[PDB]
Design a protein around this ligand. Structure first.
Ligand SMILES: [Mg+2]
Lengths: 102, 102, 102
C-alpha cells in the first residue's frame, strides 16, 4: 500500500488503542476504589477494542513476510506504540486488580 | 526533514526518556522501602522529563498527516519506544506505589 | 543491509522477546499462586533471552549513529516493540512479585 493508506490506518489504531488504554486505566482506578465489578467490566470492554485493532497487525506482518514492501509511516509507528504498550497493560492488568483485590 | 535531523531528535528523546525512566525506577525502589515521600517527588520529576521528550510527537504526526514525508530513523524509532514504554510506566506507577503504601 | 536482511533480524528479535515475555507472564502466574521459587527461576531465564536480543539492539543503533543507512522493516519495528515492552516488564516484575510476596 502507499504512505497515505498506512497513515490513515495508523490513525485508526491510535484511536482504538487510545480508547482501550483509557478504559484499562479507568479499570485500575475502579479497582483502587474497591469497585471490582466495574474494573472487570471495563477490562472486558477494552479487550474488544484491542482485538479489533490487533488482527490487522497480523495481516500486515504476514504481508511483509510474504514479500510485500510496506511504506514507513510515523503515524503507523506511533499507533503500534500505543497498541503494544496497551496490550502489555492488558496482559498484566489481572494481577494489578488481584493485588488490589487482596 | 532529513534522516540526520530525525536521528538527532531521536537522541534527544532518548536522553529525556532515559532520565524519566531512571527516576520512575528509583521511585519504585523508594516505595518498596517505605520512602513514599521520596517516591512521590521522584514521580513528579519524571513527568517533566517526559513533557520534554513528548513535545515533538504531535508535530511529527501533523507534518505527515498534512502530506509531508518524514524519513525513517532507527534512533527515532527507538526513542519513541523509550518514550512510550516510559509513559506507560508513568501511567501505572501510582498503583504500584499505592499497593506498596497499603 | 537490505530490507530482507532487516526483516530476518526482526524475526530473531520477535522470537527472543516473545519467549522472554511468556516466561515473565508465567512468572507472574507462579507468584500469584505463591510459587515464588518458580517465579524467580523464570525471571532469571527470561533475562538470558532479553540479553541476547538487547545486545543485538545496541549494535544496530550504533550502526546508524556511525552514518549507516538502515532499511525500514515492519517486522523489525514490531520486534522492537515486543523487546521494549518486554524489557519494561522485566524491569518492573520484581516489584510485582514482591507485592504478591507481601
Ligand atoms: Mg515503536
Amino acid at each position: 500500500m502507499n504512505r497515505e493508506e498506512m497513515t490513515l490506518l495508523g490513525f485508526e489504531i491510535v484511536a482504538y488503542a487510545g480508547d482501550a488504554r483509557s478504559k484499562l486505566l479507568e479499570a485500575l482506578k475502579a479497582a483502587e476504589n474497591g469497585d471490582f465489578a466495574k474494573a472487570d467490566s471495563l477490562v472486558v470492554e477494552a479487550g474488544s477494542c484491542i482485538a479489533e485493532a490487533h488482527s490487522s497487525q497480523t495481516g500486515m506482518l504476514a504481508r511483509e513476510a510474504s514479500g510485500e514492501e510496506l511504506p514507513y509511516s510515523v503515524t503507523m509507528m506511533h499507533g503500534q506504540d500505543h497498541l503494544m504498550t496497551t496490550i502489555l497493560l492488558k496482559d498484566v492488568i489481572h494481577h494489578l486488580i488481584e493485588l488490589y483485590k487482596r
